[PDB]
Design a protein around this nucleic acid. Structure first.
Ligand SMILES: [Mg+2]
Ligand SMILES: [Mg+2]
Ligand SMILES: [Mg+2]
Ligand SMILES: [Mg+2]
Ligand SMILES: [Mg+2]
Ligand SMILES: [Mg+2]
Ligand SMILES: [Mg+2]
Ligand SMILES: [Mg+2]
Ligand SMILES: [Mg+2]
Ligand SMILES: [Mg+2]
Ligand SMILES: [Mg+2]
Ligand SMILES: [Mg+2]
Ligand SMILES: [Mg+2]
Ligand SMILES: [Mg+2]
Ligand SMILES: [Mg+2]
Ligand SMILES: [Mg+2]
Ligand SMILES: [Mg+2]
Ligand SMILES: [Mg+2]
Ligand SMILES: [Mg+2]
Ligand SMILES: [Mg+2]
Ligand SMILES: [Mg+2]
Ligand SMILES: [Mg+2]
Ligand SMILES: [Mg+2]
Ligand SMILES: [Mg+2]
Ligand SMILES: [Mg+2]
Ligand SMILES: [Mg+2]
Ligand SMILES: [Mg+2]
Ligand SMILES: [Mg+2]
Ligand SMILES: [Mg+2]
Ligand SMILES: [Mg+2]
Ligand SMILES: [Mg+2]
Ligand SMILES: [Mg+2]
Ligand SMILES: [Mg+2]
Ligand SMILES: [Mg+2]
Ligand SMILES: [Mg+2]
Ligand SMILES: [Mg+2]
Ligand SMILES: [Mg+2]
Ligand SMILES: [Mg+2]
Ligand SMILES: [Mg+2]
Ligand SMILES: [Mg+2]
Ligand SMILES: [Mg+2]
Ligand SMILES: [Mg+2]
Ligand SMILES: [Mg+2]
Ligand SMILES: [Mg+2]
Ligand SMILES: [Mg+2]
Ligand SMILES: [Mg+2]
Ligand SMILES: [Mg+2]
Ligand SMILES: [Mg+2]
Ligand SMILES: [Mg+2]
Lengths: 113, 54, 44, 90
RNA sequence: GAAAAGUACCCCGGGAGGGGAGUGAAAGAGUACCUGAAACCGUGUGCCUACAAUCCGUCAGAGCCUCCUUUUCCUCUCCGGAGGAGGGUGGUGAUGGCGUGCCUUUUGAAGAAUGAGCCUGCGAGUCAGGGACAUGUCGCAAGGUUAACCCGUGUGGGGUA
RNA sequence: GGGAUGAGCUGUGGGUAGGGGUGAAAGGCCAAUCAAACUCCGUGAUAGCUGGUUCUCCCCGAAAUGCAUUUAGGUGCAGC
RNA sequence: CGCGGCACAUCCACCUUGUGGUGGGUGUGGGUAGGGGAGCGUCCCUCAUUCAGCGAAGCCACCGGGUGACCGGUGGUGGAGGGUGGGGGAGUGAGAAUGCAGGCAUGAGUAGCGACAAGGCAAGUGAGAACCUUGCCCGCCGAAAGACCAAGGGUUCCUGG
């Protein structure tokens, strides 16, 4: 339907839910309008998420050879990867569990007039 | 108090969808001939070189 | 005895109560060193 | 092995079935030999040969056709000379 | 992976990670690696839901969407069904009636009695003995059968206590 | 808040071991457990007590009474 | 009661008249504890036969089938073992045991982030600085929150990464 490019950032050490809070700002926006929402968004997941939209636009510019002023984030989502299990010691001998969660972030930009 | 019963898939999604970041507004800045985007509350420091645009 | 726990370490009293040369003085201790060789422990 | 360093072999089963070449190096503890000309591996820079299994080669008897190989006590030293089958030479 | 041939070179990035090339029969085999199920988490899309009291289903049932097909046309037909009506799969279910989860244990439980957060895996009437009783069947039958042991590569042949 | 030259507090080294120790006596303490510690073995202890016991269909289908019982929430025999 | 399907029992007629088959009447078929009879499914061995790198097992989807457990067809994924028939043997079927091992939800982006000494600015380094370096202000301890040994720990010390 449209020419496109894909970029994946596997094993990003941001939680999947705290990454989904920030991908819902830039879904369906143009790339020049998405890399500056993520600049002035105070959340910390906008670091790793904006390094994938910028590389999906760099993959569509170099490899496919597309005009960068017409791109748009057509499909972006975040999944989970593996989880490390840690121990946080608590009162009266109880030992609880901490989960270090990771993510996979997929951005599919596309060129459309 | 403890949860008496686990919440079903329709009550744990109606609450969780309300935890979300609010987007900010962006305005236009032309300093040093390069057009950028800042929020309006930082419009003064954009025209004084106090904003690092990375 | 407030705050004091049960293991106060001292390496000289460890070897005079649990050492090798105190196992080897009685028949009940030769058969502990033999039952830990038979199991294959590193430390006896 | 029964296939040495200096021998010339014929590949009897593989992608290079029918090609002749001499052994460059033999690996007796894996039953594998290096034959020049066979299975060129396009290794990335920073082509050479990979070893094939020694059961895929037969020794050329210095007379053309390949053969299985046997042994003959030389009656002078006692060291068994590695001789060819199919009419008994070298 | 059969073989390390373990992704040279370029690109975004501090890296991690990726994209294009490349190797390979296969990268739907990339040192997080054969096959890759379920729980669980997303994204896109069709229908439904913001005046309604719901063991969450079942029977009745309108409307929308999707996909295959007789009819009379558009004869542009070598076309395509272009659309609507008719009929039939699949998805949703406005609305009406009916409707007190499962197990264990009890005179009696939807029970405000017990047990289970979910999924995948494991987890409970078995075996020994010329034992005992009773049967179904097979061989021999006024007789039936050997045990230890001996001889054979065997599951076969001897062996009357 | 009580003692704070005393029946004081404390370091280091040693001694007392399970029907035994030790106790200015509370069944206290003896390695976060004591009206008889912990570990291993007898051992897959025993429990008239509770829990569990997994595929299908076809036919038939009860009892909760009598008698005896260290027996009354068990079991033998009869009834069904 | 009517029309059509199934099963069990009994009776009357046929066929090698009980190992029992075919046809026709009348009767019967709620069911726990329990008794009886007949079957589906996974695995293993043996005998016969037949598929499979022109794609077996396993998994996923769809369309069909049988009175039930369940079965077949076509396609997708996948890469080396299955199907049918006569027999033999079982670690042969889970949903519950506050069962066990692993993975993952709900609570929930919630509580908490460990003393009531208290940090601030400038310049620096760097992709990244409330916490790192340097300088100056401010505050806390000062019978210790300073300086040393013993027990204990064992390379935590210094330098360069
Ligand atoms: Mg503790
Ligand atoms: Mg060979
Ligand atoms: Mg690459
Ligand atoms: Mg590629
Ligand atoms: Mg190729
Ligand atoms: Mg192939
Ligand atoms: Mg393949
Ligand atoms: Mg994995
Ligand atoms: Mg895999
Ligand atoms: Mg309405
Ligand atoms: Mg009502
Ligand atoms: Mg209804
Ligand atoms: Mg009661
Ligand atoms: Mg209940
Ligand atoms: Mg309730
Ligand atoms: Mg009870
Ligand atoms: Mg419970
Ligand atoms: Mg369970
Ligand atoms: Mg008989
Ligand atoms: Mg005082
Ligand atoms: Mg006083
Ligand atoms: Mg005083
Ligand atoms: Mg008393
Ligand atoms: Mg104690
Ligand atoms: Mg006792
Ligand atoms: Mg015994
Ligand atoms: Mg028992
Ligand atoms: Mg009945
Ligand atoms: Mg009885
Ligand atoms: Mg009836
Ligand atoms: Mg019945
Ligand atoms: Mg029953
Ligand atoms: Mg294929
Ligand atoms: Mg198998
Ligand atoms: Mg099937
Ligand atoms: Mg198939
Ligand atoms: Mg298949
Ligand atoms: Mg099978
Ligand atoms: Mg068989
Ligand atoms: Mg069988
Ligand atoms: Mg079993
Ligand atoms: Mg299960
Ligand atoms: Mg668990
Ligand atoms: Mg809360
Ligand atoms: Mg808080
Ligand atoms: Mg703190
Ligand atoms: Mg600074
Ligand atoms: Mg240091
Ligand atoms: Mg250092």
């Amino acid at each position: 339907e449209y020419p496109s490019a894909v970029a994946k950032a596997r094993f990003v050490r941001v939680s999947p839910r705290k990454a989904r809070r920030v991908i819902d700002l830039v879904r369906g926006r143009s790339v020049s309008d998405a890399l500056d929402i993520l600049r002035w968004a105070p959340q910390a997941a906008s670091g790793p998420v904006a390094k994938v939209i910028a590389s999906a636009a760099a993959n569509a510019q170099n490899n496919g050879g597309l005009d960068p002023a017409t791109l748009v984030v057509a499909t972006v989502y975040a999944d989970q990867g593996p989880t490390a299990k840690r121990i946080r010691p608590r009162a009266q001998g109880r030992a609880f569990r901490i989960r270090r969660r990771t993510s996979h972030i997929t951005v599919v930009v596309e060129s459309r007039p | 108090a403890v949860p008496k019963r686990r919440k079903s898939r329709s009550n744990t999604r109606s609450r969780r969808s309300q935890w979300k970041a609010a987007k900010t507004e962006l305005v236009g800045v032309t300093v040093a001939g390069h057009a950028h985007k800042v929020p309006r509350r930082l419009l003064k420091a954009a025209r004084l070189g106090l904003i690092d645009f990375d | 005895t407030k705050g004091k726990r049960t293991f106060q370490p001292n390496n000289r009293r460890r070897a005079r109560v649990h050492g090798f040369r105190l196992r080897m003085r009685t028949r009940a201790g030769r058969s502990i060193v033999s039952s830990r060789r038979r199991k294959g422990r590193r430390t006896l | 092995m029964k296939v040495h360093k200096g021998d010339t072999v014929l590949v009897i089963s593989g992608k290079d079935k029918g090609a002749k070449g001499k052994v460059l190096q033999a690996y007796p503890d894996r039953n594998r030999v290096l034959v020049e000309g066979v299975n060129r591996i396009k290794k990335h820079t920073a082509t050479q040969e990979a070893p094939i299994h020694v059961s895929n080669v037969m020794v050329v008897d210095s007379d053309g056709k390949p053969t299985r190989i046997g042994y003959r006590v030389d009656e002078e030293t006692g060291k068994r000379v590695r001789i060819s089958k199919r009419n008994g030479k070298d």
